[PDB]
Amino acid sequence: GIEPALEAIARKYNCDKMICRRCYARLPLRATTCRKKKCGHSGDLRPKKKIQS
Amino acid sequence: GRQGNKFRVTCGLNNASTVNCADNTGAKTLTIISVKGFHGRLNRLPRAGCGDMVVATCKKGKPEYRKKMHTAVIIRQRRTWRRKDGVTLYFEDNAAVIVNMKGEMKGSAITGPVSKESADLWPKISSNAPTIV
Amino acid sequence: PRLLKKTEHVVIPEGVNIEINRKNIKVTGPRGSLTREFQHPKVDIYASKLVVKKEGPKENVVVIDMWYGNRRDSAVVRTIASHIKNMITGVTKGYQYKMRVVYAHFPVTLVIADDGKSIQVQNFLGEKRTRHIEMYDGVVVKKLGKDEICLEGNDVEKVSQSAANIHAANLVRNKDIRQFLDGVYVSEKCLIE
RNA sequence: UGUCGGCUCUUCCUAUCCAUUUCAAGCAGAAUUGAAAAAAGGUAUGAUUGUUCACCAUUUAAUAGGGAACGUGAGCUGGGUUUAGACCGUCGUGAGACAGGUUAGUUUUACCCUACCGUUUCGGUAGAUUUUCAAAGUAUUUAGAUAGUAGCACAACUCAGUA
RNA sequence: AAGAAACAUAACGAGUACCACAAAAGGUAUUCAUUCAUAUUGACAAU
């Protein structure tokens, strides 16, 4: 029993992020570069996949 | 299928050890192949104490039981073992009964006494056990 | 490339006193006293007066000045200026961070100590382990309402870290976190006043 | 320079099989899959075969892959290969040939230096003079540069037939 | 062996040819140069 208001702030901390296709690291929404060194600061990122019921 | 823990019982039954089958399920003797839960070591043979589930084959019995691998529980052994209350005791022969993984006994009777170590571990055995020594 | 001179300033309001002794700013205001050390070997922090409005008058400022330096080091002038600016806000209108608790099925209880220097989180996702989470000096937790707490303090570095410490202790492990949206989250960051 | 394999034993590599910490999923849970840190600890029992290899039956948290003169014969064994006896099949006129099969076939020496493990003997560390001090000898009580390092894993109950 | 200027150096990176090794590829890392557009009475970012 969670209000949609509480959904909005909980999703942003967990869901609304980008993912480096090489780092696998969790990146901010407006990020345009793999932050971690091992992935070579790559520039190919994808959004985190949403839950589908 | 086992209930609770078991204290240290010095395992006197080796691999390829023939034991009697005190059950009534047409199997005379069983020879131990492996012991469930045994943790391996180099050159060591699997060991079984009282109340230990084993994997065994029947080399003497009815055709529906012979030449097949079964699961058995050791109920008594000739190996001297010591209870935590300073009682040193050992039986007259090694024997086992055939039970499945869930623990429910295949047969419905047991001949002779049953060790408390095996009885407490498997409730179904104690219900069919005449005496629990 | 190297900038010959990069300068930033922070204005001091009427109720704030700033004293600087070898990159050691102490700020005292209506709410209390704050102190920090900026151990960057290439910055010059000193008070002065400077006209900051196009037509406004002079006003007391703290000038952070850095001379010839690469862009790696020229970026610290504005960082330190922002840090001093937060001190002035902290000792004048302190910072408060409102954190709201989210659970799916198991209610979560927060046991706040009497002094407010410690909290306790219980029954998080049905667990039996109890999380304590200490608080930094100068940071005070309190129960705002139902399933909500706010942290009160002067230093934005202490307040924000303590709030993040509470969230970091209540992460979901080995489960799909897109479904188990549990924990304590920062609703918003604002000023006490 | 004793030429296969096995047995015994130590160490090393990580391109990790398990346990530990993390990120991702077309991750609801459970079970899995991709990837990062990390090589300190573990990684089995047997039928057949001289086999390395293989293929089966189990057990396990896992039953990972490799190196060290294809580690290791004055460490063992001698099953194979690889002399000399003998048999068969094919080849050859014949003596004889056959990474074709079969059976029987001596495995020597360390007491030397070093390495390693333990164990004795003799020698010995520099700037202080508050005689309540300073140094030399003998004995006890201590000190700790350095070197090594050890604890792991699984199961049962409760959480709970709950999320 | 003293002075001068730089691109390096938060890394077992760099360091005396033959020589005792490293590639493709990627980076909103960094320095310099060329070309183009916006550049004001007001471009970009924010409000």
Smallest CA–CA distance, residue A19 to chain C, in Å, is 15
As for chain C, the residues directly before each break of C–N over 2.5 Å are none
Instruction: Please provide the DSSP assignment of B4-48 as one string.
Output: S--------B-TT-EEEE-SSSSEEEEEEEEETTPPP-TTPPP-B
For B90-94, the CB contacts below 8 A with 24+ separation are B91/B115, B91/B133, B93/B19, B93/B20, B94/B12, B94/B13, B94/B17, B94/B19, B94/B20
Q: Is the CB of A53 under 7 A from strand D?
A: no
Q: Token pair for residue B13? A: 């039954």
Q: Token pair for residue C50? A: 């400077």
H-assigned helices in C138-188: 156-168
Counting beta carbons within 10 angstroms of the beta carbon of residue B6, is it exposed (0 to 12), middle (13 to 18) or buried (19 or more)? middle
Q: Token pair for residue B23? A: 């059950």
At which residue do the structure tokens 């240290």 appear? B8
The values of phi and psi at residue C91, to 5°, are -85, -5
Chain A residues whose CB is inside 8 A of the C104 CB are 1-2
Beta carbons of C31 and C154 less than 8 angstroms apart: yes
Which residues lie across from C2 on neighbouring strands?
A: none
Q: Is the CB of B42 under 7 A from strand D?
A: yes
Q: Is the CB of A22 under 7 A from strand E?
A: no
* E strand segments, B36-106: 53-61, 69-76, 81-82, 88-89, 95-98
Resolution in A: 3.0
Q: Does C173 reach chain A within 8 Å, measured CB to CB?
A: no
Report how far residue C99's alpha carbon sits from residue C144's, in angstroms, rounded to the nearest whole number: 9
Report how far residue C155's alpha carbon sits from residue C83's, in angstroms, rounded to the nearest whole number: 10
Task: Please report, as a single letter, which amino acid is at residue C82.
Answer: S
Q: Is the CB of B101 under 7 A from strand D?
A: no
Q: Could you tell me whether strands B27-35 and C121-122 are parallel, antiparallel, or unpaired per DSSP bridges?
A: unpaired
Q: Token pair for residue C38? A: 């900026």
Beta carbons of B29 and B21 less than 8 angstroms apart: yes
Report how far residue C127's alpha carbon sits from residue C144's, in angstroms, rounded to the nearest whole number: 24
CA distances, C141 to each of B71, C85, C113, C187 (Å): 61, 24, 9, 15
A7: helix, strand or coil: helix
Smallest CA–CA distance, residue C108 to chain A, in Å, is 13
Tell me how long chain B is: 133
Counting beta carbons within 10 angstroms of the beta carbon of residue B9, is it exposed (0 to 12), middle (13 to 18) or buried (19 or more)? buried
Q: Token pair for residue C112? A: 């706040």
> Does the beta-carbon distance from A9 to C100 stay under 8 Å?
yes
Q: Could you tell me whether strands B88-89 and B53-61 are parallel, antiparallel, or unpaired per DSSP bridges?
A: unpaired
Beta carbons of C35 and C24 less than 8 angstroms apart: yes
Q: In sequence order, what are the residues at sequence separation of 6 or more whose Cβ sits closer than 8 angstroms to the Cβ of residue B121?
A: B2, B3, B4, B6, B51
Searching chain A, which residue's CA lies closest to the CA of residue C168? Answer: A13
Nearest CA among B13, B90, B10, B24 for reference residue B56: B13
> Does the beta-carbon distance from C178 to A50 stay under 8 Å?
yes
Report how far residue C64's alpha carbon sits from residue C77's, in angstroms, rounded to the nearest whole number: 6
Q: Token pair for residue B77? A: 């052994």
List bases in chain D with any atom under 7 Å of a protein Cβ. Answer: 7-9, 22-30, 34-37, 43-46, 57-63, 154-157, 159-160, 162-163
B96: helix, strand or coil: strand
Task: Please report, as a single letter, which amino acid is at residue B40.
Answer: G
Report how far residue C31's alpha carbon sits from residue B122's, in angstroms, rounded to the nearest whole number: 71
CA B91 to chain centre: 13
Beta carbons of B133 and B103 less than 8 angstroms apart: no
Beta carbons of B45 and B13 less than 8 angstroms apart: no
A21: helix, strand or coil: coil
Q: In sequence order, what are the residues at sequence separation of 6 or more whose Cβ sits closer than 8 angstroms to the Cβ of residue C169?
A: C121, C131, C133
Q: Using the structure, give the distance in angstroms from the CA atom of C86 to the C1' atom of E30, rounded to a whole number.
A: 31
> Does the beta-carbon distance from C185 to A11 stay under 8 Å?
no
Beta carbons of A42 and A51 less than 8 angstroms apart: no
Report how far residue C160's alpha carbon sits from residue C152's, in angstroms, rounded to the nearest whole number: 10
Q: Is the CB of C41 under 7 A from strand E?
A: no
Q: Does C185 reach chain A within 8 Å, measured CB to CB?
A: yes
Q: In sequence order, what are the residues at sequence separation of 6 or more whose Cβ sits closer than 8 angstroms to the Cβ of residue C46?
A: C20, C62, C63, C65
Report how far residue B78's alpha carbon sits from residue C119's, in angstroms, rounded to the nearest whole number: 61
Q: What angle do CA B12, B13, B17 make, to 5 degrees?
A: 150
* Number of Cβ atoms within 10 Å of the Cβ of C171: 12
Instruction: Please provide the DSSP assignment of C42-80 as one string.
Output: T-EEEEEEEE-SSS--EEEEEEEEEEEE-HHHHTHHHHH
Q: Token pair for residue B93? A: 């022969």
Q: Token pair for residue C187? A: 């609703």
Nucleotide nearest to B55 (CA to C1'): D58
Nucleotide nearest to C71 (CA to C1'): E30
